[PDB]
Design a binder for this molecule. Sequence first.
Ligand SMILES: Nc1ncnc2c1ncn2[C@@H]1O[C@H](COP(=O)(O)OP(=O)(O)OP(=O)(O)O)[C@@H](O)[C@H]1O
Ligand SMILES: [Zn+2]
Lengths: 72, 214, 261, 71
Amino acid sequence: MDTLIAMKRTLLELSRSSENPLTRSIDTAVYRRKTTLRVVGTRKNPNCDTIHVMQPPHDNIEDYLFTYVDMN
Amino acid sequence: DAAIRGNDVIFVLKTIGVPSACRQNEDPRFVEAFKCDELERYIDNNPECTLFESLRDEEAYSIVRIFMDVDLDACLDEIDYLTAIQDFIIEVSNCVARFAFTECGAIHENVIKSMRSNFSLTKSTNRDKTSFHIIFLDTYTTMDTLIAMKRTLLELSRSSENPLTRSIDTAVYRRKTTLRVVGTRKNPNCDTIHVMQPPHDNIEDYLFTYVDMN
Amino acid sequence: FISFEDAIKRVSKIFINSIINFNDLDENNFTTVPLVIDYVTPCALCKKRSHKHPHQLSLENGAIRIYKTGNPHSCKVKIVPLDGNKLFNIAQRILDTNSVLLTERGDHIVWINNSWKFNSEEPLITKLILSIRHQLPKEYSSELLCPRKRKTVEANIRDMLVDSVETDTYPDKLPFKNGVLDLVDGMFYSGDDAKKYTCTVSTGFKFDDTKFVEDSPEMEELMNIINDIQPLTDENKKNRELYEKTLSSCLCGATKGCLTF
Amino acid sequence: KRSHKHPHQLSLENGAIRIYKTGNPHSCKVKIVPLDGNKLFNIAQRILDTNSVLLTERGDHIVWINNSWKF
Ligand SMILES: Nc1ncnc2c1ncn2[C@@H]1O[C@H](COP(=O)(O)OP(=O)(O)OP(=O)(O)O)[C@@H](O)[C@H]1O
Ligand SMILES: [Zn+2]
């Protein structure tokens, strides 16, 4: 974990330096204590109708979970 | 135009919320017309008096100096204050010169030189606030010009980022404007006043109706 | 203004550290609850270390001001706007400087290096934008180092110019590459003083007062040539009186109604 | 001014070098120098300082390569 909280300055300075189009639209404060990430297919609120659209070639649930660790 | 006509009498009020009819009646208890020296004597002998400066009749003589007010609810160190005031001066000069060239048909360089040559600043006795009135000595214009330029000033205040520039209040440019006299008590139960500036040790450099075209 | 979530986004990018009370900010109480951040890296406002008091946010003039409770000098004051684009503001400032103008011929004249220049096939506007970055605040100068942002600012400036202006209206001023001299007084204006007279042409050689001396050996030998060409004789004085009339007529920039042989 | 009797001083803040006169700061002017920029702009500045590319009066660019000037 504690690595993620230390590169935040590094990626923010890279985004400020690099002028690639989508690089200007990254998030830095996401790396924090007790970080919460939205699961695919789960809405933020019932009022909101925005859901995550599944993208091939990965279809399984473990393909989109950073809390799962496997050794291959 | 005016040429020989140069304002030297100073119109001064004594209390906010002056009754309407008594202004035309010119009651001595609220309206006074002085000169520089006797006004200085009147503010020296009475330290608890409250004085407010304003014009009497703009229908015949409505030419005044350029004046602006700034007030921010924070404290700044000397160096940051100097940097902010320099950038503020540059930006305000550019904006005013651009407006004058675009609408009034004046000359950009003359306006910039006149407004950046001489200007008078004040300070507030409060420690936790940064407020001042700025007077441009060598620039003269009509009140309607200030009314028209109010919108551009508001746009500049909204667009900018300097803390001093964001604090400009454009509400002072309206019909029957009033200003606080420097070194004068504001409220009967308030000790906050304005002080002098070492560049300018004369009272006549801190009035926006005293006109003298050199 | 803008979306509240974007305001929290910008505020959280400003604070390099994370806050603990993130869930406690709402649309109606963000100006009251104190703000305490996690302490692993010194705050971006002031270096210091481990600020001992919470911060606070205030809303004024369509902007958010961040101030630290306690010692005013402990942490630096920061103002975050929520209204417009930075490039538009930069273009507005550049226009306010009054350095690029539109002529009736459809070309743009630019004040670069104490002179007015215009090109019908080259974008001098980008060069002006790059050159003028020294007269702008710190936060604006960094954005002008990227060519794409310069092109965007140029597009905004080109969109902003609607009216045209006249040029070369004073026939009594002689322009140079370093300034303009007045024919009625002989005084030479350089730099910003020459910006008043919109002259788009120049002699091509810079002015220099060192050679502009009457008491010089080079001047003395010129009367010999002028007497050889035009003898100072009475019967020719009328011709002499005419000879200087045409010769001095070349300086001005007004239309002449006569032909000379 | 005359000889600036009080010595000057340097500071660094938000990626900028600030120069200010000690003693009475109001007797001088505070100057700012940005010690930051793009890498590509720095490369272009170095190449320009090498003085290998020039502009002609006819609108053409001349470069210096292989010990020769070419346009
Ligand atoms: N405690 C927090 N610290 C930092 N940022 C936070 C915190 N809580 C929420 N946010 C931010 O608030 C926003 C809320 O998520 P939003 O729906 O806007 O986008 P997202 O992060 O792309 O979504 P998702 O939840 O699908 O990953 C995000 O930008 C998130 O980083
Ligand atoms: Zn701090």
